[PDB]
Amino acid sequence: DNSRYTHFLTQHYDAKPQGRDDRYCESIMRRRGLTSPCKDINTFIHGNKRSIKAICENKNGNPHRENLRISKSSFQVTTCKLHGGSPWPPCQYRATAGFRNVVVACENGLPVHLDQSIFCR
């Protein structure tokens, strides 16, 4: 069963994003179902899927902390951070685009979790 991988892609993958500004964040967070209630922080990885899956192997990854994996390559990413006091929609997001390696957890050679702690600031 690979539903967690599918869910990883829904929450954390966007191949070819359209301008990574606040309005990008506000739209994709709605489109991916992450606005009821408003997710506090969420990061999307860009580029191709095969590079992300490779983090699960020696090809593009190293072990990290307690049973996570950290990528060797750097990825284009965009972090969407909720602002305003309210947990409920409409959800306003601030976008932060970036370029660095990423931390995931893998199961059966597929990523199933993105460690959001490296994108908090």
Author numbering: 2 to 122
Share the article's original sentences.
An important structural feature of ANG is that a part of the active site (i.e., the C-terminal region of the molecule) is obstructed by residue Q117 (part of the pyrimidine recognition site). It has been postulated that movement of Q117 and adjacent residues is required for substrate binding and catalysis. Mutational studies on C-terminal segment of ANG have also shown that shorter side-chain residues or deletion of residues affects the catalytic activity and previous structural studies have revealed that the segment containing residues 117–123 in the wild-type is highly mobile. The ALS associated variant R121C has significantly higher RNase activity (131%) as compared with wild-type ANG. In the crystal structure of the variant, the smaller side-chain of cysteine appears to provide more flexibility for the C-terminal end of the molecule by destabilizing the closed conformation thus providing better access to substrates which would explain the enhanced RNase activity. Similar observations have been reported previously for the R121H ALS implicated variant.
Like RNase A, ANG cleaves preferentially on the 3′ side of pyrimidines and follows a transphosphorylation/hydrolysis mechanism. The enzymatic activity of ANG is several orders of magnitude lower than that of RNase A towards conventional RNase substrates, but essential for its angiogenic effect.
